[PDB]
Amino acid sequence: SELLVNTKSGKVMGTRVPVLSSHISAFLGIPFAEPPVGNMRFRRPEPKKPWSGVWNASTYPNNCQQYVDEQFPGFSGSEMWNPNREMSEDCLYLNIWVPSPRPKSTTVMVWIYGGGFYSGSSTLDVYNGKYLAYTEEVVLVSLSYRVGAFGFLALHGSQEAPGNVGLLDQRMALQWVHDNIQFFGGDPKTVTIFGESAGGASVGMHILSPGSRDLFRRAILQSGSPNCPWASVSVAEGRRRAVELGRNLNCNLNSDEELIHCLREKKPQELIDVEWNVLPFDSIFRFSFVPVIDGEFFPTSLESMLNSGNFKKTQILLGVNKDEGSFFLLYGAPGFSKDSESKISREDFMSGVKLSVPHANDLGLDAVTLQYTDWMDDNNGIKNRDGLDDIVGDHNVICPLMHFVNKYTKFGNGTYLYFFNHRASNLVWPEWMGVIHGYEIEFVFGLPLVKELNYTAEEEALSRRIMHYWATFAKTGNPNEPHSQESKWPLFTTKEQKFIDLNTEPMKVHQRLRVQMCVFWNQFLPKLLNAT
């Protein structure tokens, strides 16, 4: 049967799902690890013991335990990102969409969800792999991984809570795809990993980690890169936050053993209730438990790895959105509101700068403020709002990504860079937020092909274009069809630094994406902070 697949771990039974007036096979909730529950909380994942019988893979699995966004109850803009399945520590599963009839050996794409390493679900409507698998005839995988303290609590030196175990969750799913996707018609030698935000940083982290490089062919990173200021902490900061967490829960803090045992006795929501209290600064775009620079998953610092070429050399496709910052200002900066234009007073602007660069001294705040203030019109509330927007996105997403892309292209085998700046016509968020963090995903997964979702015909064309860029890149290492008459997406090179816009207008090619601000964020400001 087409819905029955024999794997090295056992048989699985999928389900036939409709898609665009056709059908494909879906294998939902396949386990790839032992449930990381009980005494295994905070530990590295173990591989799933093979099973007898037929595993029912007809339904979506549980989502991992996470903080849940209640800032706008009933509002689809925020709740479409919340878990849409019961939460459970028993959450290490993956999902596969397979073209029908079953392919023999086809291109594989593995989706890694974002969410600041504190949240995320493989089961969201916007991650439904059936449109991409059907349209582009790829085998689409989405994995899952522990977030929050459950995935990233780091007590370096301990083997019970070493840190990075959510990254190892991802790697074990990658190992499982490598070992088993051939049975689903996937080609294990042509696996592209792709992800957005924390998932894009994750993709970059598997590019860097020697233990991960061999498990995939090429990589796509959307609005995230491994060197992002929020994506990792040192071993000392990870230890400090773990101890502060136990301090929030009245834990014996005498030893790692005491602390871990206390934290393992707590119910999941107890950890989530206090998770945000361990941040060291009054900040935005900073998350409590994230990957740790441990000398094991990451052999040395990220910057020295990037400088020495210590990373997998292959092709990469990556990009950013126009207004990456607006989401985080909405949720955490004074003066921003969902239902107003959020014109920003000068006081509020200064408050925003401080939340945005929480590690900066007062001279650093001044440097940032000078760089982003039109002093001919300092009380322009729209310029203050857009200026804060740019600060948050430049510092947290665009300029770290530009630093990564420039270090990587020196040693890599091909780079394609995009600037996604289409505001969707059916967007439920306010105008001022612009082209929001995460809102290219629905185009990458082909949601505008579904008529009931109220996109324009031009947006369907843009989605089909992006889906084909991405799958063609996954298949060949080049998003362009050979001998095609459509406009070509030029390679990004050290010399020319070309990129394209992604929108409903005819493709335009630019160079040196936001280079003025990224020189400030990547060269000048770190020098200023290190000297003062």
Add this chain to the structure above:
Amino acid sequence: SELLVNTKSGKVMGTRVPVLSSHISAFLGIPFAEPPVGNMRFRRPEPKKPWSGVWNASTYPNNCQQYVDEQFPGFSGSEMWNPNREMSEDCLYLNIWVPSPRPKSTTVMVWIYGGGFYSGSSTLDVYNGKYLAYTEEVVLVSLSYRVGAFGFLALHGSQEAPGNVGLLDQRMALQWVHDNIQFFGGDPKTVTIFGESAGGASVGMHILSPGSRDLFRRAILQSGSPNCPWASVSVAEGRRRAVELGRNLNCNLNSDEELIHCLREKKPQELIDVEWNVLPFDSIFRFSFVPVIDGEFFPTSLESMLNSGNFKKTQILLGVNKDEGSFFLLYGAPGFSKDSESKISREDFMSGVKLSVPHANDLGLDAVTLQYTDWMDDNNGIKNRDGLDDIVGDHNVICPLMHFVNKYTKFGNGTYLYFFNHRASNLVWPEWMGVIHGYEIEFVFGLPLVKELNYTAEEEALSRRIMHYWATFAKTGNPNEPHSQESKWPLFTTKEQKFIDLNTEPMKVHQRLRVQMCVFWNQFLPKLLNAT
């Protein structure tokens, strides 16, 4: 007789000079001090002993001893600024142009020449007062003062070489005008002092100095202000340079008495031969012997005087030119040449930055470089050339002046601000130098009214406009004619910060002159340097 005038110091006999197919009276080379020669070198000026008989005031006096520009022999662009009279330490004289017939009690304007406190002459063709005196019916005075070491060698604590004596030369000329201009038909209660560059800084310094405030009514500063980074040094730096000077001349350095006596034995050219060797940095737009913050002429620091309102409160007219920096880059920065377009390589740009901010550390140089580099086009040699031009003018002229004008307007009684950006049609300097430091003077003194000098009719109109703005301001404290139908020059206020362009086009009003760069030069960079 109209050419004979009885003053408190004695009688003087002027000469009738032609001007624009008419005639006026000129009284040239009137002494206002004792010759500061011999044992008086470096000392405060003494007042001139009154004389018997009639002083022959028919000819221009000697110019003070100064370094002479030989960088372009025979080239009128540079030599029109050189002394055009024999040099002598016997040089403390002033010149008066008087309308004919002699007025009874008219507006007086006193010109103070520029030249970095190391050079300058009252006798230059471009300072000929006859056009302004004739056209606007003012009594035009030009004074002189010691420059170089002769005017500004500073051994604080010594009464033989206290410093600032060139400023006291200026003040004694002002005292003489106050005491005697009534006899020439001048009104001593309506004296405007005006000057360019070091002379504009000089004007600002008499505004600040309590010993000078009472000797004039109002003030005009052109491309110079008292707080300029080159216009003054501390008492310790003045002492260091004085000692280094004696070290260059094999002087006994055991005591101030030893040092001063040695320096007084030297011929003037011996001092001039080594004057440039005492600068502490590899710099441009820095001069060896300048005013010193002595606690006497200047009671406290300039910044605290400006903050507390400790200065004469009156009306001021001031402005800058578009390309103040190009002169100094031509003479001292690598890659700039009189006869090429001076397109500037990146290496040369970096060299220029270091010469321009010689007191900056490497982080400060980076801040400057970032502020003035278009990183989308970093190898644009024209952008590097114009960028260096702007750095030099912003840092040395425009932004210090903007700092002065903003501090002053808080306490003053009326400010008028101009941006002079007309390139003269007969300019002999290359195109790349633009609207050069000092090249508004010829318009202020009415040279375009002389047909043989090859200006356009529009330039004659601009000169007449500027002459009338200036004389009307000198007469009333407002450059605008009351109940006039011509376009009005708005007051500069703390709130609106309006200024005008001065060129051959219809007047345009702008606000916040070069405010973006001046926030960098006046707020951020000093903070950066003081913290690092």
